[PDB]
Amino acid sequence: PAIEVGRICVKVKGREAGSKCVIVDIIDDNFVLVTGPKDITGVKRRRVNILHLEPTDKKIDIQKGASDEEVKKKLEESNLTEYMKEKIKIRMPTL
Numbered sequence: 437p438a439i440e441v442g443r444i445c446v447k448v449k450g451r452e453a454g455s456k457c458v459i460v461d462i463i464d465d466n467f468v469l470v471t472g473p474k475d476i477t478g479v480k481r482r483r484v485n486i487l488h489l490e491p492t493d494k495k496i497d498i499q500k501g502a503s504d505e506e507v508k509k510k511l512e513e514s515n516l517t518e519y520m521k522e523k524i525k526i527r528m529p530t531l
Contacts, residue, residue, distance in 0.1 A: 441508050442496030444514055445470055446524065447479075448488065454524025457480045460507060468496065471507050476521050481507065487492040 441462065447455045455477050461469030466486045472479030481504060483518065495513065502510055515530040 437493060437496065440493045440496055441468060442498050443494040444492050445484070446490040446492060447484075448490045452528065453524060456486055456520055456522060456524065457482075457484075458507075459508065460502055461500065471504075472509070473511065473516055473521075476516075 445457045447453045457470035457472040459468050467483050471481045475519040
């Protein structure tokens with residue numbers, strides 16, 4: 437899927453850095469727009485460079501530049517309501 441955007445990303449790094457996000461934008465060229473449920477995963481909307489890429493197998497279809505409310509509706513295409521909400525690391529809130 438990394439050949440084309442329109443998919444979901446995971447943050448990888450040591451010491452707390454696992455968060456799931458949906459990618460939807462191409463910026464200058466090496467930067468993309470990413471979003472996640474602020475209430476659960478904790479990521480709202482932010483931009484990340486290709487230098488940290490973690491792609492998963494998923495669907496491809498973004499209008500391009502969606503507004504936040506429009507971006508949130510797109511998350512449902514991702515089916516976050518229960519497929520996700522994974523808590524990538526057991527340690528995160530009180531730990």
